[PDB]
């Protein structure tokens, strides 16, 4: 159920690795920067129940299953 995931960015302090049910590659235009993030998703009994995010202007999220699946995937804005 749990994979190893690449960890880059805010949620990863200050580790390169991560453990979750899904790995993600994230992107958002923040403060004139195209900030990128990689890490984990894990289902709890409430809150965010989906790794996948409904698309919004300025943001894009792409999720995957498998060990280090997020390594060769990067979220690209449409």
């Amino acid at each position, epitope marked *: 159920k749990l994979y190893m995931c690449v960890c*880059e*960015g805010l949620s990863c302090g200050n580790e390169d690795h991560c453990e979750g049910q899904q790995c993600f590659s994230s992107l958002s*235009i*923040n*403060d*004139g*920067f*195209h*900030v*990128y*993030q*990689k890490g984990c998703f894990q289902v709890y009994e409430q809150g965010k129940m989906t790794c996948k995010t409904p698309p919004s*202007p*300025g943001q894009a999220v792409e999720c995957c299953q498998g060990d280090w699946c997020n*390594r*060769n*995937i*990067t979220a*690209q*804005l*449409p």
Partner: antibody
């Protein structure tokens, strides 16, 4: 749309400190993120440091991390690079550049003439 | 960390000749940025996104690619095209890495 000019460069000694400055045309300065890219003589381009529009996000290169500090002043339209514990391989021409952000892409643009930093005894 | 390999290191082309400069990445990347640098001059933005020319850049220039393999192209080699061309990676968490560069010369 924006002009950038670098300064503060010169001869410096190993293990010592120096502060580079990048003065903008403005006042569009506070509309873009800012970057430092260095070029060693006879060699390629190496990204050094990044700072977002309001100093929210800061990034460094690994060879530079801990030693250098990137600063910003939107009121004075100036970008800074505090350099400490300077090494022989830090000897380079130092460009400052603005990050241009579109909803599809981002890139570096409007690179200045650069400033020469030399680290030797 | 992404590593960009540019090919060839140097090439010399006759006026009018078609040119392709390659930029290979160690992993898959979203898009590729290209810069032209002339001697004693700063690098200018040449191609952003993957295939988008900067303003002032001739239509003679072209960009293409996907995943790891990316290329800059010239439909007709000219004298003003003499420079070193660098590809830059931008589409991840730092560092933002440049390739070694391809020095382009004009056969005369």
């Amino acid at each position: 749309e924006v002009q950038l000019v670098e300064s503060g460069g010169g001869l410096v000694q190993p293990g010592r400190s120096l502060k580079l400055s990048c003065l903008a045309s403005g006042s569009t300065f506070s509309n873009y993120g800012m970057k430092w890219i260095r070029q060693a003589p006879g060699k390629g381009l190496e990204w050094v440091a990044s700072i977002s529009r309001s100093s929210t996000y800061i990034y460094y290169a690994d060879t530079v991390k801990g030693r250098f500090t990137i600063s910003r002043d939107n009121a004075r339209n100036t970008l800074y690079l505090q350099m400490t514990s300077l090494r022989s391989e830090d000897t380079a021409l130092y460009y400052c550049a603005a990050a241009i952000s579109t909803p599809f892409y981002w890139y570096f643009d409007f690179w200045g003439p650069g400033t020469v930093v030399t680290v030797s005894s | 960390e992404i590593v960009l390999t540019q090919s060839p290191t140097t090439m010399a082309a006759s006026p009018g000749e078609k040119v392709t400069l390659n930029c290979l990445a160690s992993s898959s990347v979203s898009y590729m940025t290209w810069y032209q640098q002339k001697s004693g001059a700063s690098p200018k933005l040449w191609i952003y996104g993957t295939s988008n020319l900067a303003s002032g850049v001739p239509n003679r220039f072209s960009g293409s690619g996907s995943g790891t393999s990316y290329s800059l192209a010239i439909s007709s080699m000219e004298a003003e095209d003499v420079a070193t061309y660098y590809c830059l990676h931008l589409t991840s968490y730092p560092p933002y890495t440049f390739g070694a560069g391809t020095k382009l010369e004009l056969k005369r």
